């Protein structure tokens, strides 16, 4: 649904604004990513009633907050620099895995295991862990 909604919003900008010739305030929207979050699922059976067969199926709960962890930065893009020729790559995360290059990508520089990870040039995403009672 989320991918459909993202495409639908893209279609909405294309169809309802520029195809309708109303305006053109959609240039950047082609690039930004959307997400739609369902909230009002029918009343559920509570935490103590949940069962293993309910895994991966959207449910609803209520509770009280007790402990909140700070904003943990989660990796999304890795920044690598070659330790002998200073070439910089941009490796993205695919399904939660980091693929470290074994050789420098440049034709001239082909030293094996010559790449290094720079911690503070990476791009992170906010992760918060909340505890509910």
């Amino acid at each position: 649904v989320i991918s459909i909604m993202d495409q639908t919003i893209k279609d909405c900008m294309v169809s309802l604004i520029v195809d309708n010739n109303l305006d053109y305030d959609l240039d950047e929207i082609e690039t930004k990513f959307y997400k739609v979050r369902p909230y009002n699922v029918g009343s559920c059976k509570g935490m103590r009633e949940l069962n293993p067969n309910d895994i991966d199926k959207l449910i609803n709960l209520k509770g009280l907050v007790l402990r909140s962890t700070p904003v943990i930065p989660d990796m999304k893009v890795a920044f690598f620099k070659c330790n002998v020729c200073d070439h910089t790559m941009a490796v993205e995360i695919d399904r939660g895995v980091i693929q470290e290059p074994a050789r420098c990508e440049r034709i001239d520089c082909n030293e094996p295991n010559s790449m290094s990870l720079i911690h503070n040039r990476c791009s992170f995403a906010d992760k918060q862990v909340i505890k509910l009672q």
């Binding site: 103590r48 949940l50 069962n51 293993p52 895994i55 991966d56 399904r95």
Partner: protein
Amino acid sequence: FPPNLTRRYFLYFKPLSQNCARRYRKKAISSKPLSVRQIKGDFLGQLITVRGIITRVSDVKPAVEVIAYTCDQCGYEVFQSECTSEECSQNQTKGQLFMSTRASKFSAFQECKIQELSQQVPVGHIPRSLNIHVNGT
């Protein structure tokens, strides 16, 4: 593929009724109510009945039995890092195994501690406890 991946049923047994065993002239042991002190190691693997009071109840927890993996190189499903399927084993290149929880076998699990009743304890001792596992529905 293994049958257990599709079995939607769970199997249970209930013991012989003492009235029926006496009627058929047999010495039933399955339905005899046993205290944790009478439960020796000799009865390991036997079907027995335990009589006592519940003291602790663990909440419902999932329990995996067979972990299912998928290989993009060959498309086979491996049931338990590198794919051990026949195609990848013969080939020089082997696909990486990725865990798939949807196809994995899961069961509902709880653990409960039973404790001896007062009349079962001989004078001078402490009421011992035994662990009970509950699985399935």
